[PDB]
Design a protein around this ligand. Sequence first.
Ligand code: ADP
Ligand code: ADP
Ligand code: ADP
Ligand code: ADP
Lengths: 298, 298, 298, 298
Amino acid sequence: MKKIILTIGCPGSGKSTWAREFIAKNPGFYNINRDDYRQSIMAHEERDYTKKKEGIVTGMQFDTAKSILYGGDSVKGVIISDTNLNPERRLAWETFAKEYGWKVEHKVFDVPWTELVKRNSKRGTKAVPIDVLRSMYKSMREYLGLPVYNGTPGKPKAVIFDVDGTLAKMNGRGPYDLEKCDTDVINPMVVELSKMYALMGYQIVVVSGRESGTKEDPTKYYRMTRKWVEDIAGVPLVMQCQREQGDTRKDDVVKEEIFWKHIAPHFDVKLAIDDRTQVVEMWRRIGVECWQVASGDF
Amino acid sequence: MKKIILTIGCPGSGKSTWAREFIAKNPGFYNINRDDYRQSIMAHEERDYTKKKEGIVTGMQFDTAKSILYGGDSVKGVIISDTNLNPERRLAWETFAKEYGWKVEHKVFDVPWTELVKRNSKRGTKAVPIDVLRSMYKSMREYLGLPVYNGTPGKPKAVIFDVDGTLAKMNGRGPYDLEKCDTDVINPMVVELSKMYALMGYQIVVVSGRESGTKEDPTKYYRMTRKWVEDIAGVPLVMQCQREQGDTRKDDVVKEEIFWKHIAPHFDVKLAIDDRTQVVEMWRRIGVECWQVASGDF
Amino acid sequence: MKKIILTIGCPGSGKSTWAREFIAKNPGFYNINRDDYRQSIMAHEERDYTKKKEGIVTGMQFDTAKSILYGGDSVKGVIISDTNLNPERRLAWETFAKEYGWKVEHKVFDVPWTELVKRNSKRGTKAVPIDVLRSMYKSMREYLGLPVYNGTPGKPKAVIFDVDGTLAKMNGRGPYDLEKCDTDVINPMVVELSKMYALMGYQIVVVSGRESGTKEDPTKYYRMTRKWVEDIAGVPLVMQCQREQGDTRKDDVVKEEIFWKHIAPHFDVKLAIDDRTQVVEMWRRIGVECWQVASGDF
Amino acid sequence: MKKIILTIGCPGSGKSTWAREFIAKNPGFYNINRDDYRQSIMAHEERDYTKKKEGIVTGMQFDTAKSILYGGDSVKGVIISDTNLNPERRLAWETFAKEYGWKVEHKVFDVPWTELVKRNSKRGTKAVPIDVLRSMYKSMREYLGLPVYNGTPGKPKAVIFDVDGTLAKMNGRGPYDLEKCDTDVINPMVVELSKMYALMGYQIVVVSGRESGTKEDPTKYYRMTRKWVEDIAGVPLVMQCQREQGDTRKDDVVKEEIFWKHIAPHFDVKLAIDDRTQVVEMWRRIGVECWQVASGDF
Ligand SMILES: Nc1ncnc2c1ncn2[C@@H]1O[C@H](COP(=O)(O)OP(=O)(O)O)[C@@H](O)[C@H]1O
Ligand SMILES: Nc1ncnc2c1ncn2[C@@H]1O[C@H](COP(=O)(O)OP(=O)(O)O)[C@@H](O)[C@H]1O
Ligand SMILES: Nc1ncnc2c1ncn2[C@@H]1O[C@H](COP(=O)(O)OP(=O)(O)O)[C@@H](O)[C@H]1O
Ligand SMILES: Nc1ncnc2c1ncn2[C@@H]1O[C@H](COP(=O)(O)OP(=O)(O)O)[C@@H](O)[C@H]1O
């Protein structure tokens, strides 16, 4: 059968680039894009929203697929290089292909949020607002079937606190120089908050993206951080999780893995306090309310 | 009735700009472009030619017109912002509109050749080869019903010779400084050519884009040029035509007007010898064989 | 004297555009840009940081100013179209101009933060990271001599809470439809927070960008909001400030004016809880620690 | 010593690309470009000519070279990525480097005229007018020390005539289908011209870019062409030169090689008649007056 290839991915994920390259290497494939169409019927009005226009672009897409997909044995298929993140539209393509006898394949472009943001900020006039991008990424996560937290019944309620930038600031050292992280001063209001919650009966769970330690001393930083939280901040934590030694992945990935493995099953986490934008974005995205206490664009 | 507006014009004539502006001012109008389509189905392969692809783009255009033109009383019409310089395709749009009951209007963008070339050279990746541009302009002229020469029966055969850059060069003066045009030296081979033709029985007609003269002396330059051709070159001309005093139009326009009014009806012109690119382009375009004797890109 | 015009403004404020336009209208003025230089010596390496390179660009700038500023009576001056937000560099230009006898003028481009961000997100490859942009804006504010809060001694400590998106969410209405703002449901954790602080002895000050009311009923929304906070949330507030009726300025401006006039002189504000990104950015920028409780990119 | 690398090449020859790549691979090298400077002092006025501005850019270049070239052992050299096609300016760089003790190297980018034109037509806003490009190429040829014809004393005078498009047109075949080149019809006026010159005593030399023949019959086309010229056109030629079988180079190169080897030493060639633009450009460039008899943009 002729293929109908739907690209699935948030804007800037590489869908168009792939489409061009693929067509350049496999004769018999054509591209259909709601976007070449959207810009076209408007004579290229800057992207800076009608149900009718969208109805036109939709008609263009299917009518164009039918015509192309009926060429001779020369035509192999069509690529629908849109985000295709709306489930109903994806279904519409499959039921369309079933009645005309064509097969539907998916070409996924799962790019990390941090890469999506980075690329999007350079997209120029094709850049998309952060809120629609975050919305696209949420749909992408639902497509991949990634987990969303909804509480842990029968478990004590808890608040998650990060260390760097949240409970602590930094008294003249420098990001990634943990050897002197014992000099960090307290962020008064946040430190105070953690004590307030404890009094309210919440379990205080501390998390940190600081590497636990070095190759020869795997918990060097985990220990200093623990002493700092105990002796300097005075935070009555029930648990302290931290990036494992050697682990070079993004705080992003590291903290979520830590969450599902070590926190979610033991606590009914009601809140997370953090400062790094990519982490704060991770928390809210997986279902955990998150309060950002300072600028964290790094 | 709903309108189907066909833009008629060579590339770079302003068709897209107008289309955007018009849609921005008149809600209910949509744009259809073989080109948004051509680039789209190929995932934007650089423009640097199949009868099948063109068949697809064509289908897209009509199918898209039908759908749009059938919206409610909200839709006023569609703009077909292509060159639409191929007569058969223009007819195809009119017979298409007649059977579905829509009206066809034309929005012409007649830009002068010299402006087309100028703009095209800056078009970047959308620039078109000079030969296809010259071809587009020829079709545009046929659309406008502009005249093409095919000889003048019963009249003596003649060769047209230009002066500046052709019969004469320039001995240290400067373009537009006719006050010293009497110092020009002969272009030997070309001067010799004119005498050769005379011997062959051709009438030698001299033409010049040099203003005839000044406001107080309207033939100052016409006279010097005539003396130069007689005494210095020794060209046995039967007629000498020249740009009228005060006339500020392009050599382009000036020489063709001169041709139809004063030459075409009295001579069977078989050839024209010239050096300025825009003039040489004019000659060939209206049906007169033209030999360019030197670089004339000014 | 010849002028040395320093443009003062964060990237994207219009410095280059103005410079081009000004030179186009006033012959005798030349442009010097650390940036044409930075890109140039590197053969245009993508902007994606050496003290030596910067030393070169600096030398280029002054050496180029000296040469230009010494032309004849034809030269009027030079424009230094950089951000010029670093005070020491600004001083360096003035002491440079004093010893050579030239005058220094400033051309300020004070664009609102929200406009800077908006423009920056479309800047493409010239876009600047949000953290350096926020840093530029902080220096711009210091240039303008705008106020920075540092506490109010002798006054009771307080926490500022916003309503929309912070204490309340929204149960099926829509932004700007205050007529049904009485249906908003509580944001449990945040509502709880306000009570926690009260117990700790902090004064709870509520702020809202919701227009107080309509032309015929100037406190319609102020009253509903007040009842909602009292009866539904149960927030023990000491004061409630809100956007005045008719006022169409940005929440940005509105809340800061409200802060200086009605809050700062009566309270020692230690914290602000809010959700809208532009407001959260305003709080931190003027010296008030701010916790963002949810995505607020609208 | 520190190096001063001058790039030598017409615009579009790859000078900037090379410069970026080289700097990216060899730390210690900086780029100086009259052009980053020209655009910069004018706040980027579209390129669409003062002796003073040029004086400023010049000062910027040398002053910037001195400063850079005096860094520590870290600096290796500077690249002057301009065309550097003006001999006096090249000399100025060498005498500048001699007095300060630096060495001057050249990095040449000799791109074929046809490639220069091709690239230039796509250059967009950086495209250069054809006449300045042709001027740049002439200087490049003088730099390379390429030959320029100035006549052959003691030898009979001759006119060179091309076949395809000049003496012959084409009666329904197609470029590169020589198997049916025997069907070409005469271009009357041009054929007549060749006879006129013969009567005047000129030697008629015929040249053709048509491959002489095939691998199994190396003169198949040379013979048909010769018969066509003899029996159909009636051209009294003294010599017939033609592209050798197997030779795949551009007509460009092929005809000039043919000229120097077989024509220049036996004839005092006074004129060449041709129709292909790249060939016509070759003729004039090497010193031979050339008349283009029809559009030859292919
Ligand atoms: N692997 C990559 N690394 C760096 N940049 C990339 C990569 N892939 C794509 N980009 C850039 O991101 C932007 C997204 O382009 P595009 O292919 O059209 O994505 P999409 O069609 O999914 O919106 C482009 O400017 C592109 O050059
Ligand atoms: N009146 C004008 N003066 C100068 N430039 C123009 C003018 N009109 C159009 N152009 C330029 O010429 C190019 C042709 O653009 P476009 O509008 O798309 O023409 P077309 O659709 O006919 O090919 C554009 O880069 C445009 O900016
Ligand atoms: N008043 C304005 N309205 C909308 N966009 C603007 C305005 N002024 C400038 N811009 C855009 O913002 C970007 C900033 O350009 P630029 O003039 O170089 O600023 P700067 O030199 O201060 O960094 C440009 O892309 C420009 O077109
Ligand atoms: N080898 C090549 N093949 C195709 N295009 C090229 C090549 N080299 C350069 N170009 C293109 O030609 C233009 C000339 O660019 P540039 O490097 O700045 O040349 P120059 O500095 O000599 O004027 C560019 O748009 C470039 O991408």
